[PDB]
Amino acid sequence: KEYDVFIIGSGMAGMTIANKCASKGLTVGITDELPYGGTCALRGCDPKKVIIGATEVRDFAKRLKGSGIDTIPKVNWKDIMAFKQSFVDEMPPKVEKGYKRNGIDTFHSSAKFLSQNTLEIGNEKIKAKKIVIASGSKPRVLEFEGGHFAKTSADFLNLDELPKSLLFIGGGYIAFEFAHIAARCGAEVTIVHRGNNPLENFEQDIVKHLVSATKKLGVKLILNTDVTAIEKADKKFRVKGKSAEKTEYFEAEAVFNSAGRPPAIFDLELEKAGISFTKKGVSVNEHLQNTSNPIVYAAGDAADSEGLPLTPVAVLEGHTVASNIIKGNHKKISYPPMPTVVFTLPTMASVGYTESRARELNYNIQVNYKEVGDWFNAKRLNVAEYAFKTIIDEETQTILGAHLIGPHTEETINLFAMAIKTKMKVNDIRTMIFSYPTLASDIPHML
Amino acid sequence: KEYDVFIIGSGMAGMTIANKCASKGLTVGITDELPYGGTCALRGCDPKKVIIGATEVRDFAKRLKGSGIDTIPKVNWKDIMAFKQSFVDEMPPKVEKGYKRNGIDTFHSSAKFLSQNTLEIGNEKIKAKKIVIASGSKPRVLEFEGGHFAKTSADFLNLDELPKSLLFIGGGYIAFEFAHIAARCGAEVTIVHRGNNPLENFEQDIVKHLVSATKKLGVKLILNTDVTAIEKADKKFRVKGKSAEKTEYFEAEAVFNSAGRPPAIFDLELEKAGISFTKKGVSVNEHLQNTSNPIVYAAGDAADSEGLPLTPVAVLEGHTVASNIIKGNHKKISYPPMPTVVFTLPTMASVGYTESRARELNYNIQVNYKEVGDWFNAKRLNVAEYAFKTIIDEETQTILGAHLIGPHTEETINLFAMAIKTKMKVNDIRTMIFSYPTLASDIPHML
Ligand SMILES: Cc1cc2nc3c(=O)[nH]c(=O)nc-3n(C[C@H](O)[C@H](O)[C@H](O)COP(=O)(O)OP(=O)(O)OC[C@H]3O[C@@H](n4cnc5c(N)ncnc54)[C@H](O)[C@@H]3O)c2cc1C
Ligand SMILES: Cc1cc2nc3c(=O)[nH]c(=O)nc-3n(C[C@H](O)[C@H](O)[C@H](O)COP(=O)(O)OP(=O)(O)OC[C@H]3O[C@@H](n4cnc5c(N)ncnc54)[C@H](O)[C@@H]3O)c2cc1C
Ligand SMILES: NC(=O)C1=CN([C@@H]2O[C@H](COP(=O)(O)OP(=O)(O)OC[C@H]3O[C@@H](n4cnc5c(N)ncnc54)[C@H](OP(=O)(O)O)[C@@H]3O)[C@@H](O)[C@H]2O)C=CC1
Ligand SMILES: NC(=O)C1=CN([C@@H]2O[C@H](COP(=O)(O)OP(=O)(O)OC[C@H]3O[C@@H](n4cnc5c(N)ncnc54)[C@H](OP(=O)(O)O)[C@@H]3O)[C@@H](O)[C@H]2O)C=CC1
């Protein structure tokens, strides 16, 4: 079998490129070793956010207790899992039906290269004129003793019962979001992180408020401790934590792998196709084309790209690859502001540069950082943690970055994104009119 | 007593101008016939939004019932009133303390003009070089029989107990927002509106979904019926409704005046100062200066201005008046997009032009209207009503307006505001990156 385009993975990147390429009369083939839809839809952003919803109900009631609410609901684990599970189950049929409907050849096996332009799909041989690697990323294989007793983000999202005690290895997005969920549903939770700081790429002047919020929730955070072993006891697990000071041991029903997500490229036999790759994924140029094999493109978490491993980024990288495969190399990938969020309660969000990174680019900057728990918006919702840090280019009076924790920040952060992209002057923002009363109306006050 | 500036009203407009003028070394005087802070802070946006908060808790629980929540909280009227009351009581001391601190002379009586440049404050005579009318607006005096049994928006916001049955006269913002509150707290509610359409200045293709949402909530909406009398029965009120077809009578514990808000200018003896006014408020030029008396300025709901009677508008009108009083007439008032919201659940929001108004300006337009109750964002929150209408200038591929109902619309509408003001191209918006999963991420899909 010979195609114009063969795609590895039908997550956000792979789908985006299948549908677009098919639409311009190319012959399209695509395999996923798992149900079609990718990580976000099946085992990431979407199943998570559904579940977070039921926690939002408890937290909001807990917050106005005695101020007009007299009962704080317990979350019904089964019911919300079941509700989550419905969005999950309905996704693959939808996608497949879209493929058969667009004239896209569909496969359901793991893929290895046999040569430059040729693929072993399950127990078949397949060839193409252009190949795309959109296989995303996968839980880190924990190399040390007991490593394999680490359950995944995906396992977490599938649990029939919430354990009595959880422990997350690695203090990033997942550990914190899943700790909030787990804690709000009535489980003890521990996060063990080898760094001196959690959530290391966020503005620590902001992070500390979430760390505060997290601990008030009863969650244990251990810093400066590397996890080096797991041992299964009677209906328990026992975890080794190594610091400079000591080795300590932690007991919990259930241990989870939060330790970051390497690209899903290491079982692909890329060497057999003369395809250049680092440990951050497939190596790409301005056209998202591989640097040795000129017939290969990549997009999403699998791509060693200047873009953040996020759902909207996999799509934008999709469109450049799709377009360059279709018309030849003509379009260079261009990244706008890449807003990011930690779906804790309260949510934290960031866009553009941190202080530290703004200084590294030798910008003369203004910083505005303030803790504003006393502002009407935080006060009326009884959310204790509300703080912001903005970074203004002093010379052009345009925004370079903004980092927020508090109510609706996952929404509000997009206005800062729009602001950065449109190169809006700080004064045009100050004299602009918002709906009130809203969180958006606090922006003029952050400068 | 002789001042550089005397201000009538310390709501948003009056405050804004006091503080700014004082700050540039002018002598400032200011009276409010009520506690300092204005309608928004004391008897409008702020006390309302606090209360709406406790309803958000019930509605969100009601929405995920059986999907992970097993109890729908009753709202504790006293407790939330008491909570509301705290924000209300803390406002005037804050403002006064700001005045004494800025060197602002403070008065607490109703104001009438005695002449061109002269004011009767309580039982005093006062003169100024520039005078500002920032007296906002006031419930309509209901002229007909029983008119005076109509309780106010303000009375509503102050109730010790929620009645068993409410009836609102006039189907605008207040009737709908207060009906939602009242209904969610367990009272029967009726809205009586003389028009064929409710919420007449909104896009009716959107309004109808809120009308749908409102009726599913058990609220009675009567159209094409003018209210012509009220009669107090035994622990009851009985209301006359006149249509073409008939006269019908409605019984309720409590009747409220939702019938629109004339400017608070008609008891000011403006004639005695040769001050030009229509029934929409004090007549103003580009400088927000009166058109006969050249020493007078106005700002906010009291001003017959091209701006919407809203908290953020009173502020922007403040700054032009303040600035022109300070440096002389030099600055013309300029209005950006004026986002507006109906704090029902679900919220509805609008910005820029309706279809009908876009056509009136002879724009070649594209319209995108869709009901999207099936979108992930509505589905995961179980909000039945999610719909949008956008209006694109066909020629410049920039937005002219957008009208939304659904989750976080009061927030999302500001992105459309930013979009209109920054004259962002529809494609730059489509290829821009949002945080996901968020309501903001549905914008590219509305075009
Ligand atoms: C728990 C979790 C939460 C997240 N939350 C968010 C969030 O809130 N917001 C956000 O923006 N991003 C979030 N992300 C990141 C987001 O999921 C990714 O950035 C996005 O899925 C990238 O799309 P992709 O197409 O590159 O990869 P994917 O969507 O994962 O698609 C790749 C596909 O390749 C398949 N595949 C892998 N290896 C092979 C192989 N050898 N053979 C065949 N098929 C293969 C996979 O099964 C998968 O279906 C989250 C990730 C996780 C794990
Ligand atoms: C129930 C309600 C809800 C609202 N919700 C919103 C909302 O959610 N968002 C929004 O943007 N807008 C909202 N508004 C409108 C908003 O309140 C006004 O646009 C805003 O208050 C205008 O400010 P202003 O300074 O012109 O008037 P005000 O803020 O009312 O200030 C005028 C002041 O003048 C005083 N005064 C009046 N007459 C006299 C007199 N003769 N002598 C002395 N003092 C006098 C008044 O007591 C008052 O303190 C709402 C209004 C109401 C009634
Ligand atoms: N809202 C969103 O946008 C979300 C996005 N995601 C996506 O998922 C991925 C995030 O993965 P996540 O699991 O949070 O990991 P992160 O990379 O965010 O952080 C994990 C941390 O774990 C530490 N760690 C590694 N090994 C150990 C160990 N043995 N003991 C203790 N700590 C250890 C690492 O330290 P070190 O760095 O020093 O090696 C690292 O800092 C990204 O692709 C992200 O885009 C995840 C959820 C939410
Ligand atoms: N979220 C926000 O921004 C909010 C803003 N506000 C502010 O408050 C004001 C809105 O006042 P509101 O009370 O909602 O009034 P609106 O002007 O919005 O609408 C009231 C309606 O009542 C009708 N009406 C008048 N008399 C009768 C009668 N006898 N019987 C039946 N219907 C009648 C009127 O019909 P007709 O027009 O045909 O004469 C009118 O359409 C504005 O200043 C607004 O800015 C209010 C609350 C929320």
Residue numbers in the entry:
A (entry chain A), B (entry chain A): 2 to 448
Please give me the paper's original passages concerning this structure.
In this study, we identified and characterized mercuric reductase (GbsMerA), which is coded as a component of the mercury resistance (mer) operon in G. salicanalis isolated from Antarctic soil. We characterized GbsMerA, a mercury reductase belonging to the mercury-resistant operon of Gelidibacter salicanalis PAMC21136, and found its maximum activity of 474.7 µmol/min/mg in reducing Hg+2. As seen in the structures of thioredoxin reductase (high Mr), trypanothione reductase, glutathione reductase, glutathione amide reductase, and dihydrolipoamide dehydrogenase, the overall structure of GbsMerA also comprises an FAD-binding domain (residues 1–146), an NADPH-binding domain (residues 147–275), an interface domain (residues 276–340), and a dimerization domain (residues 341–447)29. GbsMerA has two pathways that connect molecular surfaces to the si- and re-faces of the isoalloxazine ring in FAD.
Residues at the NADPH-binding site are conserved, similar to those found in other MerAs, and generate positively charged surfaces. These residues included Arg141, His194, Arg195, and the nitrogen atoms of glycines (G171, and G173). Arg195, which is located at the edge of the central sheet of the NAPDH domain, was tilted toward the solvent area in the NADPH complex. However, in the NADPH complex, the side chain of Tyr174 was flipped opposite to the isoalloxazine ring of FAD by 6.5 Å (OH group). Mutation of Tyr174 to Phe showed decreased activity by 50%, indicating that the interaction of Tyr174 with the isoalloxazine ring of FAD through the hydroxyl group of tyrosine may be important for controlling the NADPH binding.
